[PDB]
Design a protein around this ligand. Structure first.
Ligand SMILES: NC(=O)C1=CN([C@@H]2O[C@H](COP(=O)(O)OP(=O)(O)OC[C@H]3O[C@@H](n4cnc5c(N)ncnc54)[C@H](OP(=O)(O)O)[C@@H]3O)[C@@H](O)[C@H]2O)C=CC1
Ligand SMILES: NC(=O)C1=CN([C@@H]2O[C@H](COP(=O)(O)OP(=O)(O)OC[C@H]3O[C@@H](n4cnc5c(N)ncnc54)[C@H](OP(=O)(O)O)[C@@H]3O)[C@@H](O)[C@H]2O)C=CC1
Ligand SMILES: NC(=O)C1=CN([C@@H]2O[C@H](COP(=O)(O)OP(=O)(O)OC[C@H]3O[C@@H](n4cnc5c(N)ncnc54)[C@H](OP(=O)(O)O)[C@@H]3O)[C@@H](O)[C@H]2O)C=CC1
Ligand SMILES: NC(=O)C1=CN([C@@H]2O[C@H](COP(=O)(O)OP(=O)(O)OC[C@H]3O[C@@H](n4cnc5c(N)ncnc54)[C@H](OP(=O)(O)O)[C@@H]3O)[C@@H](O)[C@H]2O)C=CC1
Ligand SMILES: Cc1cc2c(cc1C)N1C(=NC(N)=NC1(C)C)N2
Ligand SMILES: Cc1cc2c(cc1C)N1C(=NC(N)=NC1(C)C)N2
Ligand SMILES: Cc1cc2c(cc1C)N1C(=NC(N)=NC1(C)C)N2
Lengths: 249, 249, 250, 249
């Protein structure tokens, strides 16, 4: 009987790529989504047409609040309800937007950027662990956290917190046989609303090929970390950035 | 006239040593505190005896909540109301306690640990910057963040987020001439409630002299970073750890 | 036609496991060695028994010297001579022993530890790149514990740090030629056969993930990933394979 | 009696600023140099005019070779011969030039870049420690070593090695009371042969003031690390880079 995985923010883009590649490897998947209901259901439909009763959707807001723990617990519960087990958690969902130091309130900005990128991963990790084979968690990090975009403090804080979670949880969950690792893209699929000229400015900075990573390339590193070929790896973050983080100003 | 500094959690231990040292260097000081009212008032009294009208107290809970932004605005504002300027911010206040992944409600644990260690520092940084010469911010980090204590995930997340804030704010505030740096203790004054035997266990691990840092030694590094001797340093984090972080398991 | 790989220090242990997995994946290999001559020749023999003329050996001392560049060029040359191409270089060979700051001379310690761990990797990378005439890559065997080093191993540690710098520098510089450069950083893997079990257990007990050392094959699995089409966008990265060891405070 | 310091490559630029400031602080100094004999003697003359018998020169090639240990041993001996003691070692001398992977031989390139930047620091460290109040070593590192200049692999290798030495020697020498630390410039005094256009190009990248560090600014951080205000600091590398290393491509 097939293992099962939760992928957060899996309706589109990198999360969908990761859900698809896990499914093709033999996983049943929970496709978490927030606003993208149609895309989520559409993906689950495609996956179920390939193998029946192997995909489900689960809607959750991952903004920080006093109910975020309940929400995270429910996402994990959804995997146990559909599949009877939960082998892999992929923390992919991420809010990303500028929060200049010098319109959402600042309260909202902190709640969304810290909640999605860091607090929700921690609460999902807690629920995943409490409910417990090749068990692992993969966190989607950011290769450029030490050379950040100007005016993105809250986003940067959240991704650095996520690094701290990866290490702390790797350490504490190791005795339970749960590995915890990260994949850190540089530039991968560009924002939908980004103009082509602005996309090319990013592409030209990448040493390896002057192009963004495909979603599938990101997913490839996720698949490695969840596989038997990574059974000794925990607390590691693999950059998948085409050399981008190595380029000086 | 004399420059002014806000020091958070400045009633006792390291924050106290920082407040004293800045005051001895010629700063007027706001001593922020949460529960230690008697100690804070007592410190202001002692400093004011040295030089009249140079120390005040400001009480605030730095727990994350929808009122935290207003609280942080108020702290900065207290420095302006007392001293008519605010030249230095020291983010020292910190909650610290275990938050096991497998085990106060979880939402309280999040609010306290992430609020004090990261979100309060971000909001203070915003309030400080907006209100704006040798301007700088010093964040109290942690030298052991990459080799964390077992079961301290939320604390570790908060301190990693603080590293992210230090970098992101250094970059963003550099055009305004505000420097942003960190000081990362290893083992300094041990928890008052920790037994002498457990304290000795940590002391024994420290290569440089088999002892913890004094609060004064931590304050020394803060003083350097705020000084004109650090005029070109921003985005740097100075460990003050006696070599502890270099020691393998 | 099959690709070809050079693996340094490939006679035994992790270098051996790397050569074997590459060979199992379809690579032709050069097994470089220094003192383990019988093990190197027998390994290549067992590989050639599996598939004819798919393995050669090349002996070289990788101590720093004025002849080291020539040796390194010859190692790369031996891959082109045998197989007509060189797709993969694995810098695996390593000297490891204490060099306290406070039976070899210091100049010998410098030459062996900096030579094998850093200078020879640089010189091999140079010859590798220059000889290029679809998936080219270099993998450098780093060390997960380089920021929490063993007492009295300054030269070793300096060599492994330099190796980090080479991985980054060569990744940036070689990216325009489509050559990826990455690292694998073991924590504790195969401990010396001769180390007492009670000593081995001291190390094993410190590892979070299973209180055991990595197998050689576990280390090789990461190299195999980095050289594969699943890692085509990865360059300049160093994957720790340490079971959480570098996370553990003193 | 006044303490004594060895500064390598001290005839010009940053090493000169370091020797000057150490001298202004009360230290007697050994001004090591390789080719700059006139500039070295001129500097010794200025310092001895200020305080007689407080400065000496010592010539040495720091290229790697089988006699480099003897040369490093002699530099340390020259401090004992002039001053009767050796309290501080500043590893400042550095060769810097491109060594592309694709008129010096490669053997020479290796010997010069790895010897000056790494092996000579190790051998000086060894001799410093073997001949042994407030003892310390300060290594001049490089803030940009993780985002290196294209075609500078040997230089980068040497500076990364120097980080490893800083850590390993801090750990090993701590029991003897010798601290070991680093200062990592970003862009400071720009090279002798660089056009105005190219100087401005680098200046423009620096967040904090769009200018390079002064030699004195670099020296200020060295002074801090050897001072009594740094007595618990060992194994630390302080970036002095005006935020340069924080800037993405
Ligand atoms: N793409 C890139 O270039 C890079 C990506 N990364 C990281 O890789 C991962 C994937 O990147 P990418 O696919 O571009 O991510 P996206 O920006 O496309 O976001 C992924 C999903 O996050 C979900 N999400 C956003 N806000 C919330 C919220 N409040 N509650 C719940 N879910 C929410 C959304 O779900 P929905 O649509 O259902 O609302 C969204 O589809 C991220 O973690 C990202 O930070 C790192 C660096 C670069
Ligand atoms: N001591 C050490 O060994 C180490 C220290 N550090 C860092 O150095 C800094 C100072 O350390 P140390 O002096 O030991 O710290 P403490 O643990 O003594 O905490 C400092 C102050 O933080 C304040 N604080 C705690 N919770 C809150 C809250 N909810 N709202 C507002 N303020 C709050 C308290 O104020 P009050 O008393 O008024 O209630 C407390 O006195 C901290 O940031 C710490 O993380 C890092 C590594 C180790
Ligand atoms: N095993 C572990 O726990 C760890 C391993 N590593 C790294 O992993 C890699 C593989 O480790 P492992 O298999 O244990 O390494 P070994 O200690 O077994 O050494 C690997 C090979 O290096 C060769 N070598 C040594 N000196 C020279 C020299 N002067 N000239 C040429 N070749 C030489 C030897 O070849 P010969 O036998 O033919 O003389 C030896 O077999 C190394 O780079 C190592 O540093 C990192 C962390 C820990
Ligand atoms: N300046 C900057 O922007 C940056 C500097 N740094 C580091 O800061 C330190 C000082 O920088 P800077 O003053 O610009 O350095 P320089 O390039 O000016 O060199 C310092 C001295 O090193 C000596 N040196 C060079 N080769 C040898 C050799 N073979 N043997 C002995 N001594 C030798 C030279 O002495 P002589 O003149 O007597 O021949 C030279 O004057 C260096 O370690 C450098 O890497 C780091 C990053 C940036
Ligand atoms: C550089 C960079 C980093 C990113 C990033 C885009 C770019 C260009 N993304 C990040 N997170 C999320 N959630 N979405 C997007 C907008 C695609 N991180
Ligand atoms: C190792 C260690 C890390 C610390 C730490 C103590 C120890 C032993 N402290 C931290 N933060 C806060 N707020 N207080 C205290 C308890 C003093 N970090
Ligand atoms: C970026 C940069 C890094 C440097 C550097 C200059 C620049 C611009 N220098 C380095 N080391 C030595 N020895 N001299 C010089 C040339 C001044 N490192």
């Amino acid at each position: 009987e097939a293992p099962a995985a939760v992928v957060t923010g899996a309706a589109k883009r990198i999360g969908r790529a990761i859900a698809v590649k896990l499914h093709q490897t033999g996983y049943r998947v929970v496709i978490h989504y927030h606003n993208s209901a149609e895309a989520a259901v559409s993906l689950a439909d495609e996956l179920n047409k390939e193998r029946s009763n192997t995909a489900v959707v689960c809607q959750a807001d991952l903004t920080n609040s006093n109910v975020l723990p309940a929400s995270c617990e429910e996402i994990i519960n959804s995997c146990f309800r559909a599949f009877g087990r939960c082998d892999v958690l992929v923390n992919n969902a991420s809010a990303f937007y500028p929060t200049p130091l010098v319109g959402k309130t600042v309260e909202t900005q902190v709640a969304e950027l810290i909640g999605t990128n860091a607090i929700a991963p921690f609460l999902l990790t807690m629920s995943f662990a409490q409910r417990q084979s090749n068990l692992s968690i993969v966190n989607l990090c950011d290769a450029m956290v030490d050379q950040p975009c100007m005016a993105f403090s809250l986003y940067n804080m959240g991704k650095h917190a996520l690094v701290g979670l990866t290490q702390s949880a790797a350490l504490e969950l190791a005795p339970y046989g749960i590995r915890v690792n990260g994949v850190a893209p540089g530039v991968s699929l560009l924002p939908v609303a980004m103009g082509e000229e602005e996309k090319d400015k990013w592409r030209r900075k990448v040493p390896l090929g002057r192009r963004e990573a495909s979603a599938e390339q990101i997913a490839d590193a996720v698949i490695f970390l969840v596989s038997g070929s990574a059974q000794y790896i925990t607390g590691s973050i693999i950059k998948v950035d085409g050399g981008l983080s190595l380029v000086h100003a």
